[PDB]
Amino acid sequence: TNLVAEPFAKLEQDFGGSIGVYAMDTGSGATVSYRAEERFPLCGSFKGFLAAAVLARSQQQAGLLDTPIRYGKNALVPWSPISEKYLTTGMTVAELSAAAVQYSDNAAANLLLKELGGPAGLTAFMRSIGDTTFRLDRWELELNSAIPGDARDTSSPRAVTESLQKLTLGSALAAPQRQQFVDWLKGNPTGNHRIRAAVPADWAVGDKTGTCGVYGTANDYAVVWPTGRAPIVLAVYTRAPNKDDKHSEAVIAAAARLALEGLG
Ligand SMILES: C[C@@H](O)[C@@H](C(=O)O)[C@H]1CC(SCCNC=N)=C(C(=O)O)N1
């Protein structure tokens, strides 16, 4: 594990913070781990799991995805580029889910959390798939505080990867819901400088990013489909000790590359 770990330790030292990585080859079972059981703030990366929770609920409530959500101005919070434009009409649950995943829309995220019973409702969904590490405690935008030591609104790289595998490739979602989730991740345009930058252009990638805006705290998780080979699932999370420390997309891409090249 010393030969595996040492390039990650070098990377996080030059970054000035901590990096957590977990990658799984779903065919052979091979893994790469670095700080994989440490907690890191989720930031907006929870929004991918939120959409999966909504899709899962639609398996027990026919028509949930078509349900109209007609909201007022108070539902709007900072960084709500899609939901801001439909204030005059409303949006359906599926339209809000697409906005949360592909634009990281904060109002859409809060509206979907409300549908699920709050942050506790998303945590309960994650428990239902066997994830005991994930916890969402607060709403947007308070969940982005990323204060050193705080376990609220965190998970671990290993738990993120394991849950992502269950939702995108396992049995948790029925086929139509599973393909919708995969399509939302594949079409996400916010992560071009993160895990996607480490992956050959020929290979499809679906990802969800998070960027807290403080404490150098940012992340990405992804499924990678190498052509004619079993898919890979991976997660890369960062944090830093000072409130004004800057996050780095380049560090996330570099750590993704180190993990992908070390699988086998
Ligand atoms: C709301 C803010 O904290 C952040 C988050 O939820 O983590 C929003 C803003 C951003 S927009 C991405 C900007 N990309 C620049 N290259 C993200 C994200 O990384 O997905 N989500």
UniProtKB/Swiss-Prot annotation:
Catalytic reaction list: a beta-lactam + H2O = a substituted beta-amino acid
InterPro entries (alphabetical): Beta-lactam/transpept-like (IPR012338), Beta-lactam_cat (IPR045155), Beta-lactam_class-A (IPR000871)
Record-listed E.C. numbers: 3.5.2.6
An individual GO BP term: beta-lactam antibiotic catabolic process
One Pfam family cited in the UniProt record for this chain: Beta-lactamase2
Annotated binding of a beta-lactam, by residue: G44, K47, W79, S104, N106, T209, T211
Active-site annotation: G44, E142
Example GO molecular function: beta-lactamase activity
Activity regulation note: Not inhibited by EDTA, inhibited by clavulanic acid and tazobactam. Inhibited by cyclic boronates, including vaborbactam and bicyclic analogs of taniborbactam.
UniProt entry keywords in alphabetical sequence: Antibiotic resistance, Hydrolase, Plasmid, Signal
Additional note from the record: Initially two different KPC beta-lactamases were identified from two different Klebsiella (KPC-1 and KPC-2); they were later shown to be identical.
Role played: Class A beta-lactamase which confers resistance to the beta-lactam antibiotics, including penicillins, cephalosporins and carbapenems. Acts via hydrolysis of the beta-lactam ring. Has penicillin-, cephalosporin- and carbapenem-hydrolyzing activities.
Entry similarity comment: Belongs to the class-A beta-lactamase family.
Protein name as annotated: Carbapenem-hydrolyzing beta-lactamase KPC-2
UniProt source species: Klebsiella pneumoniae
